[PDB]
Design a protein around this ligand. Structure first.
Ligand SMILES: *[C@@H]1O[C@H](CO[C@@H]2O[C@@H](C)[C@@H](O)[C@@H](O)[C@@H]2O)[C@@H](O[C@@H]2O[C@H](CO)[C@@H](O[C@@H]3O[C@H](CO[C@H]4O[C@H](CO)[C@@H](O)[C@H](O)[C@@H]4O)[C@@H](O)[C@H](O[C@H]4O[C@H](CO)[C@@H](O)[C@H](O)[C@@H]4O)[C@@H]3O)[C@H](O)[C@H]2NC(C)=O)[C@H](O[C@@H]2O[C@@H](C)[C@@H](O)[C@@H](O)[C@@H]2O)[C@H]1NC(C)=O
Ligand SMILES: *[C@@H]1O[C@H](CO[C@@H]2O[C@@H](C)[C@@H](O)[C@@H](O)[C@@H]2O)[C@@H](O[C@@H]2O[C@H](CO)[C@@H](O[C@@H]3O[C@H](CO)[C@@H](O)[C@H](O[C@H]4O[C@H](CO)[C@@H](O)[C@H](O)[C@@H]4O)[C@@H]3O)[C@H](O)[C@H]2NC(C)=O)[C@H](O)[C@H]1NC(C)=O
Ligand SMILES: CCCCCCCC/C=C/CCCCCCCC(=O)O[C@@H](COC(=O)CCCCCCCCCCCCCCC)COP(=O)(O)OC[C@H](O)CO
Ligand SMILES: *[C@@H]1O[C@H](CO[C@@H]2O[C@@H](C)[C@@H](O)[C@@H](O)[C@@H]2O)[C@@H](O[C@@H]2O[C@H](CO)[C@@H](O)[C@H](O)[C@H]2NC(C)=O)[C@H](O[C@@H]2O[C@@H](C)[C@@H](O)[C@@H](O)[C@@H]2O)[C@H]1NC(C)=O
Ligand SMILES: CCCCCCCCCCCCCCCCCCCCCCCCOC(=O)CCCCCCCCCCCCCCCCC
Ligand SMILES: [Cl-]
Ligand code: NA
Ligand code: NA
Lengths: 98, 280
């Protein structure tokens, strides 16, 4: 059996419009390990994103952390987009400070 | 002492087809990465200045070479025996091995393997123990590997003789980072409405290290048992993030506060007060 990824999107610091922060996307609970993760700004892929080396939990499910600097604003939207063999389409989870 | 109490290495070997397999590896103190494995060079990446613990450069290079030969050899042998073990591509094997320091001072070693995301084997008492999830294939694997001269012995040495001294030396060598205290910050927000006439309040706690933390929704000095702790999530640069939520009726949110305790705060808890009507 294959396991689909759980996707959690959160900021490092409380959102303050115009203040630099870090956007995190934690992808976990998936199997097999091959996966594609992008962070998006207003539907567009963010070019400079960092990520952890592969790890896995006690139940053998994989997990990764993707992150990047970002400056929240009232209008701009951010998200995490994931592709995996268990998904027929990319799964998008939006960042929501509220 | 605070911070991690265990060391382990992991392996993820992804077999795409009969002529292509790749391995990813790394070394960890609990869930803090201290080693990377560079497949371009067949050598390790030392992520902290103290990642070699108290080992000499010569012993470290010997271990890197053991792991380089093992990674190559593992893929070679799995591909050769894949047909006899009725393997269907693609497949993925995982391994974890290491040791941990327990209360009372004993150091316990472990080695576990998985196929298809399910337990396949473990090493208990320097012996290969097939896992029931692994079926006849794991029984066949254990009977085959224990005949390998050198492998059994090398695994025994690494688990029960090299790992315990490595662990103690690296917990000591890294203590400036491993036993540091980093203070959390906390803030409040709304959560998704659980339903009609109900609200969810969220207490966010971020940037703390070490991982043990205490967060609770309160009414005065009364701890709200309905507080729901989220799973601890990572931040980059060895700190953590946690959400504590409370589902309440619209008219029962006033009077709530969130209290945070952490080892770094020297007994000075953070208290946040929820104010209604859009007053934060
Ligand atoms: C990396 O560090 C390891 C841990 O070091 C200790 O802890 C760190 C945090 C610092 O505080 C260090 O200052 C401190 O040493 C080193 O491993 C440890 O080495 C010591 C020797 O230096 C060794 O002590 C010996 O232990 C044996 C008994 O061991 C058996 O029994 C115990 C239980 O009682 C059991 O736990 C063990 O597993 C064994 O089954 C004892 O016979 C020795 O006595 C002799 O020497 C002492 C003086 O040292 C003398 O007073 C006596 O009269 C007698 O001659 C001695 O007490 C620790 O057991 C060992 N710990 C572990 C878990 O292995 C490590 O040292 C290297 O490996 C050692 C195994 C040994 O070969 C050393 O010579 C090596 O340098 C160090 N370096 C590396 C590269 O690993
Ligand atoms: C925990 O582990 C110990 C130690 O195991 C030994 O060392 C490890 C490093 C590893 O290499 C092991 O493979 C190795 O055995 C266990 O103690 C041993 O227990 C075994 C039985 O499991 C004993 O084996 C017997 O040895 C006889 C010679 O001394 C030999 O005549 C026996 O052969 C007959 O039975 C076997 C099946 O058991 C069969 O294959 C043969 O063909 C023949 O019929 C048998 O090999 C060892 O002597 C023990 N070694 C020592 C030093 O005590 C220990 O039992 C284990 N504990 C638990 C509870 O699992
Ligand atoms: C930094 C410091 C970090 C400290 C790390 C501390 C220890 C952590 C625990 C690590 C667990 C050990 C992993 C085992 C590695 C190993 O057996 O490899 C072997 C060598 O691979 C090979 O045979 C190639 C064939 C590999 C086949 C793969 C089979 C899978 C084995 C899984 C074991 C399962 C349980 C077995 C039962 C029990 C010994 O290698 P050297 O023959 O000894 O040497 C080589 C020379 O160097 C050449 O030039
Ligand atoms: C055996 O499998 C390889 C497939 O690897 C790619 O990465 C896997 C992790 C997985 O994502 C899979 O879907 C991918 O296809 C092939 O090698 C790769 O081939 C592609 C061409 O499709 C090429 O872009 C890659 O550089 C190449 N990688 C490496 C490291 O070689 C094998 O393909 C054969 O070898 C290639 C070099 C090329 O000559 C190709 O035409 C060959 O078929 C796969 N081999 C077989 C027999 O299936
Ligand atoms: C400083 C450095 C510090 C950093 C070093 C990082 C690199 C570490 C990489 C290696 C780590 C290894 C730790 C785990 C070892 C346990 C592996 C267990 O693997 C399995 O369980 C195997 C599962 C097999 C599934 C069936 C396959 C069938 C094919 C038959 C194989 C036959 C092999 C016979 C030999
Ligand atoms: Cl390699
Ligand atoms: Na990871
Ligand atoms: Na209040």
């Amino acid at each position: 059996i294959q396991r689909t990824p759980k996707i959690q999107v959160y900021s490092r610091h409380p959102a303050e419009n115009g203040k630099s922060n870090f956007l995190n996307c934690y992808v976990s609970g998936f199997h097999p390990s091959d996966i594609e993760v992008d962070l998006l700004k207003n539907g567009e892929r963010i070019e400079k994103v960092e990520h952890s080396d592969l790890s896995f939990s006690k139940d053998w499910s994989f997990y990764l952390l993707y992150y990047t600097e970002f400056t929240p604003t009232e209008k701009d939207e951010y998200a995490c987009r994931v592709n995996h063999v268990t998904l027929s389409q990319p799964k998008i989870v939006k960042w929501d400070r509220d | 002492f605070q911070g991690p109490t265990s060391f382990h290495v992991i392996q993820t070997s992804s077999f795409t087809n009969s002529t292509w397999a790749q391995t990813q590896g790394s070394g960890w103190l609990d869930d803090l990465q201290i080693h990377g494995w560079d497949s371009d060079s067949g050598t390790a990446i030392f992520l902290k200045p103290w990642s070699k613990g108290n080992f000499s450069d010569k012993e470290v290079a010997e271990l890197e070479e053991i792991f380089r030969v093992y990674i190559f050899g593992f893929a070679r042998e799995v591909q050769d025996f894949a047909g006899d073990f009725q393997m269907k591509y693609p497949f993925e094997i995982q391994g974890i091995a290491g040791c941990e320091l327990h209360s009372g001072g004993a150091i316990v070693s472990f080695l576990r393997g998985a196929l298809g995301g399910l337990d396949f084997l473990s090493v208990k008492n320097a012996s290969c123990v097939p896992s029931p999830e692994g079926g006849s294939r794991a029984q066949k694997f254990c009977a085959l590997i224990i005949q390998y001269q050198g492998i059994m012995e090398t695994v025994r040495i690494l688990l029960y003789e090299t790992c315990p001294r490595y662990l103690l030396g690296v917990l000591n060598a890294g203590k400036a980072d491993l036993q540091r205290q980093v203070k959390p910050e906390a803030w409040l927000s709304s959560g998704p409405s659980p339903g009609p006439g109900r609200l969810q309040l969220v207490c966010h706690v971020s940037g703390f290290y070490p991982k043990p933390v205490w967060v609770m929704w309160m009414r005065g000095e009364q701890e709200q048992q309905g507080t729901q702790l989220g799973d601890i999530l990572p931040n980059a640069n060895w700190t953590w993030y946690l959400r504590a939520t409370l589902d309440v009726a619209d008219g029962e949110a006033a009077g709530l506060s969130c209290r945070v305790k952490h080892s770094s705060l020297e007994g000075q808890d953070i208290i946040l007060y929820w104010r209604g009507s859009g007053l934060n």
